[PDB]
Design an enzyme around this catalytic site. Sequence first.
Site, PDB file in Angstrom:
ATOM      1  N   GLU A  33       6.058 -20.171   4.333  1.00  0.00           N
ATOM      2  CA  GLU A  33       5.507 -19.206   4.136  1.00  0.00           C
ATOM      3  C   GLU A  33       3.985 -19.279   3.328  1.00  0.00           C
ATOM      4  O   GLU A  33       4.188 -19.667   2.351  1.00  0.00           O
ATOM      5  CB  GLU A  33       6.052 -17.935   3.859  1.00  0.00           C
ATOM      6  CG  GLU A  33       5.531 -16.701   4.419  1.00  0.00           C
ATOM      7  CD  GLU A  33       6.360 -15.288   3.530  1.00  0.00           C
ATOM      8  OE1 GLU A  33       6.959 -15.417   2.545  1.00  0.00           O
ATOM      9  OE2 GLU A  33       6.259 -14.091   4.266  1.00  0.00           O
ATOM     10  N   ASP A  45       1.040  -6.804  -3.094  1.00  0.00           N
ATOM     11  CA  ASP A  45       1.663  -7.855  -3.839  1.00  0.00           C
ATOM     12  C   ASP A  45       1.808  -7.463  -5.441  1.00  0.00           C
ATOM     13  O   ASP A  45       0.792  -6.827  -6.027  1.00  0.00           O
ATOM     14  CB  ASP A  45       0.739  -8.906  -3.822  1.00  0.00           C
ATOM     15  CG  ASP A  45       1.053  -9.619  -2.642  1.00  0.00           C
ATOM     16  OD1 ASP A  45       2.077 -10.256  -2.626  1.00  0.00           O
ATOM     17  OD2 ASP A  45       0.201  -9.770  -1.697  1.00  0.00           O
ATOM     18  N   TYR A  85      12.293 -10.053   8.705  1.00  0.00           N
ATOM     19  CA  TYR A  85      12.049 -10.409   7.100  1.00  0.00           C
ATOM     20  C   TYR A  85      12.763  -9.151   6.505  1.00  0.00           C
ATOM     21  O   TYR A  85      12.440  -7.927   6.756  1.00  0.00           O
ATOM     22  CB  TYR A  85      10.510 -10.224   6.896  1.00  0.00           C
ATOM     23  CG  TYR A  85      10.271 -10.643   5.318  1.00  0.00           C
ATOM     24  CD1 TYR A  85      10.976  -9.922   4.191  1.00  0.00           C
ATOM     25  CD2 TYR A  85       9.472 -11.944   4.985  1.00  0.00           C
ATOM     26  CE1 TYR A  85      10.637 -10.370   2.851  1.00  0.00           C
ATOM     27  CE2 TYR A  85       9.226 -12.169   3.566  1.00  0.00           C
ATOM     28  CZ  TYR A  85       9.738 -11.255   2.664  1.00  0.00           C
ATOM     29  OH  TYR A  85       9.667 -11.880   1.248  1.00  0.00           O
TER      30      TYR A  85
HETATM   31  O1  LIG Z   1       7.194 -12.694  -3.356  1.00  0.00           O
HETATM   32  C1  LIG Z   1       8.610 -13.034  -3.036  1.00  0.00           C
HETATM   33  O2  LIG Z   1       9.598 -13.407  -3.629  1.00  0.00           O
HETATM   34  C2  LIG Z   1       8.346 -13.022  -1.420  1.00  0.00           C
HETATM   35  N1  LIG Z   1       7.142 -12.711  -1.182  1.00  0.00           N
HETATM   36  C3  LIG Z   1       6.890 -13.224   0.086  1.00  0.00           C
HETATM   37  O3  LIG Z   1       7.843 -13.279   0.876  1.00  0.00           O
HETATM   38  C4  LIG Z   1       5.309 -13.325   0.304  1.00  0.00           C
HETATM   39  C5  LIG Z   1       4.669 -12.182   0.188  1.00  0.00           C
HETATM   40  C6  LIG Z   1       3.538 -12.310  -0.868  1.00  0.00           C
HETATM   41  N2  LIG Z   1       3.383 -10.890  -0.428  1.00  0.00           N
HETATM   42  C7  LIG Z   1       3.977  -9.707   0.263  1.00  0.00           C
HETATM   43  C8  LIG Z   1       3.820  -8.753   0.668  1.00  0.00           C
HETATM   44  C9  LIG Z   1       4.605  -8.390   1.763  1.00  0.00           C
HETATM   45  C10 LIG Z   1       5.638  -9.213   2.073  1.00  0.00           C
HETATM   46  C11 LIG Z   1       5.677 -10.651   1.656  1.00  0.00           C
HETATM   47  C12 LIG Z   1       4.848 -10.896   0.678  1.00  0.00           C
END
Ligand SMILES: O=C(O)CNC(=O)Cc1c[nH]c2ccccc12
Lengths: 394, 394, 257, 257
Positions: free
Chosen positions: D49, D60, D175
Amino acid sequence: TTLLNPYFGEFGGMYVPQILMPALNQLEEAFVSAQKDPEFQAQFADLLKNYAGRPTALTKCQNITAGTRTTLYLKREDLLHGGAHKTNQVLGQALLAKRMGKSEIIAETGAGQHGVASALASALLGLKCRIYMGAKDVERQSPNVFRMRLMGAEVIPVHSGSATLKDACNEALRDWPGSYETAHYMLGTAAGPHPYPTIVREFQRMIGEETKAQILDKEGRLPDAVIACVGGGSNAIGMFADFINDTSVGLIGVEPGGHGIETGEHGAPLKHGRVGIYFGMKAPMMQTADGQIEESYSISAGLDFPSVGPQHAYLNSIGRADYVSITDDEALEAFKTLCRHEGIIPALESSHALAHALKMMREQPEKEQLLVVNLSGRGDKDIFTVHDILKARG
Amino acid sequence: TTLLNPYFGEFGGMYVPQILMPALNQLEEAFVSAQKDPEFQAQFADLLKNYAGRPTALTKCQNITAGTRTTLYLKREDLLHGGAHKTNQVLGQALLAKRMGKSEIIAETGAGQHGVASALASALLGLKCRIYMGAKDVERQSPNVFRMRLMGAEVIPVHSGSATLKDACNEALRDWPGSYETAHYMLGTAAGPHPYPTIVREFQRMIGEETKAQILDKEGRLPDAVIACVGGGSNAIGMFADFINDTSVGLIGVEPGGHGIETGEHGAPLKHGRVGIYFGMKAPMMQTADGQIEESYSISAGLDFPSVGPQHAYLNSIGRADYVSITDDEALEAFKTLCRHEGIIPALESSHALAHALKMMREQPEKEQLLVVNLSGRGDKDIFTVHDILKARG
Amino acid sequence: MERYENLFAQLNDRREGAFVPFVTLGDPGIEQSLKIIDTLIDAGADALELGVPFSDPLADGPTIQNANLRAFAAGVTPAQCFEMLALIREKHPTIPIGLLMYANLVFNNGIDAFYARCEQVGVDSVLVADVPVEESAPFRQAALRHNIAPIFICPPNADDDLLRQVASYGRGYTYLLSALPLHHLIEKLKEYHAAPALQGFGISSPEQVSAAVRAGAAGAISGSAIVKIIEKNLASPKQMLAELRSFVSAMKAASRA
Amino acid sequence: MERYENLFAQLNDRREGAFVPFVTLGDPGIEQSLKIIDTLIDAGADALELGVPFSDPLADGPTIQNANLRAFAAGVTPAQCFEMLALIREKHPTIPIGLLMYANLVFNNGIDAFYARCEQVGVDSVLVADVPVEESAPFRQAALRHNIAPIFICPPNADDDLLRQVASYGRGYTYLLSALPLHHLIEKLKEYHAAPALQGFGISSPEQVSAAVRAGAAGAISGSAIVKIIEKNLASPKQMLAELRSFVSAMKAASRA
Ligand SMILES: O=C(O)CNC(=O)Cc1c[nH]c2ccccc12
Ligand SMILES: O=C(O)CNC(=O)Cc1c[nH]c2ccccc12
Ligand SMILES: *Cc1c(COP(=O)(O)O)cnc(C)c1O
Ligand SMILES: *Cc1c(COP(=O)(O)O)cnc(C)c1O
Ligand code: NA
Ligand code: NA
């Protein structure tokens, strides 16, 4: 010989050099005539509605009073343009200056508030403004200084005597006798020689008259007490005036107690000084055994005048108003209370007025009482001073 | 699925992570219900009369326009409590926060104005306030910082990305999904995701409606053009709203031109950026060929948002309002004009709105036109910046 | 009052105008001030006009403001000033001695008592710089009762009411401040039998002393001028005393004619 | 889309859950990032990913915010990211490669073109972190047209409407973001024939990979965890590669059972 009284019982009068007499008398006649002049009265009513922002709201402060039997309202002259009540009477003294054909304004200032005020009214009304500020007040008030120059005033620092507000008031009185045919001396408190205590009262009196109508409409009766701070007297006599004849209403004026009355470091001549003659008038002063005049001391710049308006000494002598004192500490507490409970940052001047109302409630929390405090300005100018204090202590 | 439209033609929408959707939808339903709720409407009307000081006067500026055929009025949101129009809609977003049962407020701020605002409304209304400020904005705005702590808010500095207003807006959106059941996110402009552009308009719209009635009474007809500065859009859409259906009235929004459009150092995405999706919404942005979002640049802190409210992009696209730009210089001139001619010290934000009205008059001095400028705040916060500039040049 | 009737009579027999210099008492210190004032007298001053340092002298120009600060830097107070007034009168029994006071210094511990203490130590007049005629009733009454002449300023645009008042209320001399023609103010003050006029302010060379006599006044008063000479020679007291003797000798020879 | 149907089929034959790690492309630089991602694969990641650095990643947490800044400090841009996606697919032809994008990066130069360029270089899915289902029409349609699966987050309190939507609109995998019982969300996503669930956020030890399989999901995604290992060993790339191989080997052995 005068048209109106110069005295309020023993206090007042015109104690100035002979060569200033004709400027006083000419002022007094201009003012008598304007007060009956309906045109003048509409012109001043329109500046104060559309320019300065009258009427000023009356705010209920429910959060500060909870769990007591106090109802507290705040008359909000902090919302008037330039952020303090000083604006009401500069508009009117400038309009009088126009009615006499004058083109020039003389002013004195300490912390710089009245300096501003008289610079903004002179800018709006097309007068050429020069102001005197003691150099000590110069150097610690560079914000105010720059504002008066933005607004086109000429600013003159006075290095004589103690180089503060009173040495300013002295340089005012020295220039005016050479110039009073084209220059109006725009005094910034309800004190000095007659006619200045009467004129400043009557151009501040709408504080009181709108408080009366705004409480009558909200509570259906008059206040048990109106409360205001007392540096020279104008915002207080403006609050009190229209209530002197409603004898159940309380008039309470609050003086600065500084470090405390007992240290001698205060600004409270009305209850703690002695009758003298200085700046034109017979009133209480801060002076030595010997008669030299002293400075007041207050954390608040705006209350630091070692004398007081004569009409205040008169209404203390006959027991129609009462006067008390609040310490630098007391007022710093009341400033932090209002910021955290009502989201209103008050001027350190007005914080003493509120400090006494909070002790009125805290001392007797189940006394039923309706209290109005005149919150005479806002307190943005004072946040560095209060942060520096709080920082010095932690 | 939503109750009202999220879009104004192509622009708008709700571009947020899925887990923020229920907070938006719950806001939108709270707001629909309040707008038909007569009690809520009287509660908000009473805060804005008695606490914040509405209605705000409409001042004629005769000195600035003399010898032209311009009549210029200034709607004075600089007289509203806290000194800028930002107060109108915080009172209303806090009242909505109460109606949902919330006890907590999230806010973002840049220069610190909206931070204050949301700290004073949370203090008055008994909400616990925490605010996010980029660290760069922290360090240069220590006055604002201290005021929000006086008023009981908790202030959090954001060190990520560029550590300014947008990295703030980013940290807001990250906390709210963990907390929206007791915490309301109090966005400070007419931008972000639906419902925030509609709600901020309708809690700013009384700017316009009192301007209409106050010109109708003073001049007996409507303005040829109303004029306002555009950082995110709320004071402007508050001025314009009630005039969008009076098609002879001019709506002019003014963007910051910074150093000038050609240097690329500006805040004027509406006419000079490109459609993108960022902060929740599809609107014009300041961005690279590549799509990363940039900072705006303005001498004025308050206009430095590299995007704009979507309702502004919509009324530009259909030609019902026009948008232009004023440079840091232009606005510094208009700030010195108003201080020296009218004795009103305006915010550097509002100075761009006035700069364009002065060029409207100066360019064609014998065009007969009635002009209102929304003077959205005062400018005490800005005198050190303007003294430092003027000093650097002499 | 008497010393000044004696001195004007004596000067009229000789067809001479009086020359009156002004100094602040205790400037630049009490001992120096005493030697300045025996110098002014030996040089030919006819009368002295003498000010007591006040923290707020709203009627004085800069030269005199600085003389006050200097006396304050040496610690001078009203009490030491009355001490010095006694020693000056014990040495010089006939010179008329007038004080320039501010109102609060007189009113401080009772207006009668202050004019009593001036009577005791032998002062002959007091002019209260911030009391206009319209406020002057208690101060004139009290001064009268202790055989001290109350001095009034007559400004140069005085209307007839004021002339009439100043002539009726004052004694000793009329302080005739330098629109309105001399020749008018002077004739009118004689007509209303006012105390003899002394012209003062701005008087700083011999020719203005001759002129004020010719215009009909009885003499002239000089102060800024004397005070600057002090301010200029602070660092050399002996040279200060020399320039003062020279200036005063010149001014008083101009009154002879 | 296809690579992910192939891989889930293959993993179902072996009764194994998938383990999918997340990394930001170009962190801490383009060459290092390439060796990090060949390491993740040789250690047993089933799918990747992979995020393209965006100046404002409002969805994030801090670990990933710092990974973005690091890629920006090395100068990484979207274009270099598509360059790197081509080299990764030229070496590894069957691993499913999904991107985590922000909306403006996809919408920037036309939403169709962006899903065309992903088709060209061989990407199999894109999840747009700030596009909720209600705004997703153009992005899903376009992704569909270029044979790329649009991935949706299904949050843990999803109501039935949303479950129905997420199952109808998504492909490749769902997801499933870690009130509301697992066992319910999972059964309902099967019932509505949604793409197989991958549970993600908070997944950072082997036992949570076993658990998510037992609860019925097809596997799990780990990112904060992989990203911290990078953040910790920046100064020793060789040790970074060792700890990543160890962690990934452990997580993927937990999916075996
Ligand atoms: O950070 C994690 O453990 C899982 N993150 C992801 O799967 C990747 C991700 C980075 N930023 C995001 C925002 C929404 C969904 C996934 C992400
Ligand atoms: O200064 C002069 O030339 C004359 N001054 C005086 O005669 C003394 C004086 C000092 N201050 C004053 C105020 C009013 C009148 C006289 C004086
Ligand atoms: C100057 C000032 C005062 C003091 O003067 P008053 O004449 O005594 O009223 C009080 N409050 C404010 C806000 C001031 O600016
Ligand atoms: C913040 C501010 C602005 C800019 O925001 P808008 O949402 O664009 O209205 C304008 N004027 C003042 C005085 C401000 O404080
Ligand atoms: Na006082
Ligand atoms: Na903007």
